[PDB]
Amino acid sequence: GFPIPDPYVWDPSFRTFYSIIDDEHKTLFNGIFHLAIDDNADNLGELRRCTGKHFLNEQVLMQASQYQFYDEHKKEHETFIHALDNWKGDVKWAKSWYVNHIKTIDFKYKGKI
Amino acid sequence: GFPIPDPYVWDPSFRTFYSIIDDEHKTLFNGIFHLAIDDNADNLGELRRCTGKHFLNEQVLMQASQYQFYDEHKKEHETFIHALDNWKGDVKWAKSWYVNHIKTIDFKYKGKI
Amino acid sequence: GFPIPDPYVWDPSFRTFYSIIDDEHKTLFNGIFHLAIDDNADNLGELRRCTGKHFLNEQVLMQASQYQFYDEHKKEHETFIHALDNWKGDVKWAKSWYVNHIKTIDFKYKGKI
Amino acid sequence: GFPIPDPYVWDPSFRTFYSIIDDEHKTLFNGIFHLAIDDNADNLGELRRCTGKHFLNEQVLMQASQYQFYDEHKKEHETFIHALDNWKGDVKWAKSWYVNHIKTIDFKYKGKI
Amino acid sequence: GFPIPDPYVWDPSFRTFYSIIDDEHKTLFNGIFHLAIDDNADNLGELRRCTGKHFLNEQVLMQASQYQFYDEHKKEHETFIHALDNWKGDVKWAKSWYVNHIKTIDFKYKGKI
Amino acid sequence: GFPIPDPYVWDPSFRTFYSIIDDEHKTLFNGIFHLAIDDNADNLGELRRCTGKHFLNEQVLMQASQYQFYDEHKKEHETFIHALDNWKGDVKWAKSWYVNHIKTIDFKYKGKI
Amino acid sequence: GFPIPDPYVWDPSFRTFYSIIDDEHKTLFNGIFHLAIDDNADNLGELRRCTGKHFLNEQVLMQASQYQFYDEHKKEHETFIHALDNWKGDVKWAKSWYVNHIKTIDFKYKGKI
Amino acid sequence: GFPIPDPYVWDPSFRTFYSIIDDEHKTLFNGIFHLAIDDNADNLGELRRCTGKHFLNEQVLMQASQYQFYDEHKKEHETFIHALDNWKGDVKWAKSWYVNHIKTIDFKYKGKI
* Sequential DSSP letters for E34-92: HHHH---HHHHHHHHHHHHHHHHHHHHHHHTTT-TTHHHHHHHHHHHHHHHHT----HH
Q: According to the 3-state scheme, what is the secondary structure of chain G? A: CCCCCCCCCCCCCCCCCCHHHHHHHHHHHHHHHHHHHCCCHHHHHHHHHHHHHHHHHHHHHHHCCCCCCHHHHHHHHHHHHHHHHCCCCCHHHHHHHHHHHHHHHHHHHCCCC
Distant-in-sequence, close-in-space partners of C65: CB < 8 Å, separation ≥ 6: C112, C113, F49, F52, F53, F56
| Angstrom distances, CA of residue D2 to CA of A31, B97, B110, D11, E98 | 67, 45, 28, 13, 42
Please tell me if residue A113 touches chain B, with a CB cutoff of 8 Å.
yes
In this complex, do D66 and E45 lie within 8 Å of one another by their Cβ atoms? no
Number of A to E CB contacts under 8 A, please give it: 3
Which amino acid is residue B72, in one-letter code?
E
Nearest CB to A45 within list F64, F66, F112: F112
User: What distance lies between CA C68 and its chain's CA centroid?
Assistant: 20
Q: What is the rounded CA–CA span in Å between residue B28 and residue B46?
A: 9
Residue among E31, E66, E33 nearest E52 (CA): E31
Please tell me if residue A49 touches chain F, with a CB cutoff of 8 Å.
yes
Largest CA distance in chain G: 39
- CB H30, CB E92: distance < 8 Å: no
In this complex, do F66 and A85 lie within 8 Å of one another by their Cβ atoms? no
Nearest C-alpha in C relative to B69? C85
G82 carries a ligand binding annotation: no
Please tell me if residue A12 touches chain H, with a CB cutoff of 8 Å.
yes
Residue among C36, C29, C45, C42 nearest C85 (CA): C45
Alpha-carbon torsion, ordered F58, F64, F69, F75, to 10 deg: 40
- CB F56, CB G26: distance < 8 Å: no
Q: What is the rounded CA–CA span in Å between residue B55 and residue B102?
A: 11
Please tell me if residue E113 touches chain H, with a CB cutoff of 8 Å.
yes
Start-end of H helices in chain B: 19-37, 41-64, 70-84, 91-100
Resolution for this PDB entry, in angstroms: 2.1
Distant-in-sequence, close-in-space partners of F56: CB < 8 Å, separation ≥ 6: C63, C64, C65, C66
Shortest Cα–Cα distance, C78 to chain D (Å)? 22
CA B86-B88-B94 angle, 5° bins: 90
| Angstrom distances, CA of residue H21 to CA of A56, D6, F103 | 19, 58, 25
DSSP string, C12-23: GGG--S-HHHHH
Which amino acid is residue A41, in one-letter code?
A
Peptide bond into F3 cis (omega under 30): no
C106 carries a ligand binding annotation: yes
D82 carries a ligand binding annotation: no
Q: What is the rounded CA–CA span in Å between residue G29 and residue F20?
A: 16
Nearest CB to F23 within list G7, G10, G27: G27
CA E73-E77-E83 angle, 5° bins: 145
Q: Which residues of A touch H34 (CB under 8 A)?
A: 11-12
DSSP string, H54-70: HHHHHHHHHHHTT-TTH
- CB C91, CB C32: distance < 8 Å: yes
Distant-in-sequence, close-in-space partners of C82: CB < 8 Å, separation ≥ 6: none
Binding site residues of F for Fe cation, as ranges? 25, 54, 58, 73, 77, 101, 106
Shortest Cα–Cα distance, A65 to chain E (Å)? 11
In this structure, what DSSP letter does residue B7 have?
S
Residue of H65, H67, H109 to mutate when probing chain G, most G C-beta within 10 A:
H65
Question: Angle formed by the axes of helices F19-37 and F91-100, to 10°?
Answer: 170
Question: Angle formed by the axes of helices B19-37 and E19-37, to 10°?
Answer: 90
Q: What is the rounded CA–CA span in Å between residue H79 and residue A86?
A: 45
Nearest C-alpha in B relative to C59? B64
Tell me the CB-side half-sphere exposure of residue A43, using CA atoms within 13 A: 19
Shortest Cα–Cα distance, A38 to chain E (Å)? 34
Residue among F13, F7, F43 nearest G5 (CA): F7
In chain C the domains, ranked by start, together with CATH numbers, are 1-113 (1.20.120.50)
| Angstrom distances, CA of residue H31 to CA of A10, D73, H9 | 10, 47, 10
- CB A53, CB F64: distance < 8 Å: yes
Please tell me if residue C78 touches chain B, with a CB cutoff of 8 Å.
no
- CB G44, CB G35: distance < 8 Å: yes
Nearest C-alpha in A relative to E113? A19
Distant-in-sequence, close-in-space partners of H14: CB < 8 Å, separation ≥ 6: H22, H25, H102, H103
DSSP string, D11-42: -GGG--S-HHHHHHHHHHHHHHHHHHH---HH
Q: Which residues of D touch G63 (CB under 8 A)?
A: 56
Find chains touching chain C: ≥3 CB pairs under 8 Å: B, D, F
Residue of B60, B61, B62, B65 to mutate when probing chain C, most C C-beta within 10 A:
B65
Q: What is the rounded CA–CA span in Å between residue B12 and residue E34?
A: 9
E strands within chain D? none
Q: Which residues of D touch G71 (CB under 8 A)?
A: none
In this structure, what DSSP letter does residue B3 have?
P
Q: What is the rounded CA–CA span in Å between residue D68 and residue E87?
A: 13
Binding site residues of H for Fe cation, as ranges? 25, 54, 58, 73, 77, 101, 106
Shortest Cα–Cα distance, F109 to chain A (Å)? 9
| Angstrom distances, CA of residue C103 to CA of C2, C57, H53, H99 | 8, 18, 49, 62
Residue among G38, G106, G49 nearest G74 (CA): G106
Q: Is the dihedral of CA C6, C9, C10, C12 positive or negative?
A: negative
Q: Which residues of B touch E23 (CB under 8 A)?
A: 24, 27, 50
Q: What is the rounded CA–CA span in Å between residue B37 and residue E9?
A: 13
| Angstrom distances, CA of residue F28 to CA of B97, F34, G11 | 56, 10, 13
- CB H113, CB H64: distance < 8 Å: yes
Distant-in-sequence, close-in-space partners of A38: CB < 8 Å, separation ≥ 6: none
Distant-in-sequence, close-in-space partners of G47: CB < 8 Å, separation ≥ 6: G28, G31, G32, G34, G35, G84
In this complex, do D46 and G111 lie within 8 Å of one another by their Cβ atoms? yes
Q: Which residues of E touch H48 (CB under 8 A)?
A: 68, 112
Q: What is the rounded CA–CA span in Å between residue E18 and residue E94?
A: 23
Shortest Cα–Cα distance, B110 to chain C (Å)? 9
DSSP string, H91-108: HHHHHHHHHHIIIIIIGG
Q: What is the rounded CA–CA span in Å between residue E33 and residue E67?
A: 30
| Angstrom distances, CA of residue F13 to CA of A77, F7, F9, F107 | 36, 15, 11, 11
In this structure, what DSSP letter does residue H5 have?
P
In this structure, what DSSP letter does residue E105 have?
I
Q: Which residues of B touch A110 (CB under 8 A)?
A: none
Nearest C-alpha in H relative to G45? H112
- CB A62, CB A109: distance < 8 Å: yes
- Radius of gyration of chain B from its Cα atoms, rounded to whole angstroms: 13
Number of E to H CB contacts under 8 A, please give it: 24
Please tell me if residue C50 touches chain D, with a CB cutoff of 8 Å.
yes
Distant-in-sequence, close-in-space partners of C29: CB < 8 Å, separation ≥ 6: C8, C9, C10, C98, D30
Q: What is the rounded CA–CA span in Å between residue B38 and residue G20?
A: 55
Residue among A33, A34, A4 nearest A102 (CA): A4
- CB G16, CB G106: distance < 8 Å: yes
- CB F13, CB F43: distance < 8 Å: no
- CB G54, CB G61: distance < 8 Å: no
Distant-in-sequence, close-in-space partners of B88: CB < 8 Å, separation ≥ 6: none
Question: Angle formed by the axes of helices C19-37 and C91-100, to 10°?
Answer: 170
Peptide bond into H5 cis (omega under 30): no
Q: What is the rounded CA–CA span in Å between residue H25 and residue H9?
A: 10
DSSP string, A52-64: HHHHHHHHHHHHT
Burial annotation E95-105 (CB, 10 A radius, 16+ → b, else e): bebbbebbbee
Find chains touching chain A: ≥3 CB pairs under 8 Å: B, E, F, H
Q: Is the dihedral of CA D34, D35, D38, D40 positive or negative?
A: positive
- CB B72, CB B98: distance < 8 Å: no
Nearest CB to G7 within list F7, F11, F26: F7
Residue among D85, A39, A67, H13 nearest B85 (CA): A67
E strands within D54-105? none
| Angstrom distances, CA of residue A99 to CA of A1, A11, H8 | 10, 11, 20
D25 carries a ligand binding annotation: yes
| Angstrom distances, CA of residue G4 to CA of A110, F27, F31, G13, H69 | 61, 19, 19, 12, 31
Q: What is the rounded CA–CA span in Å between residue G50 and residue G60?
A: 15
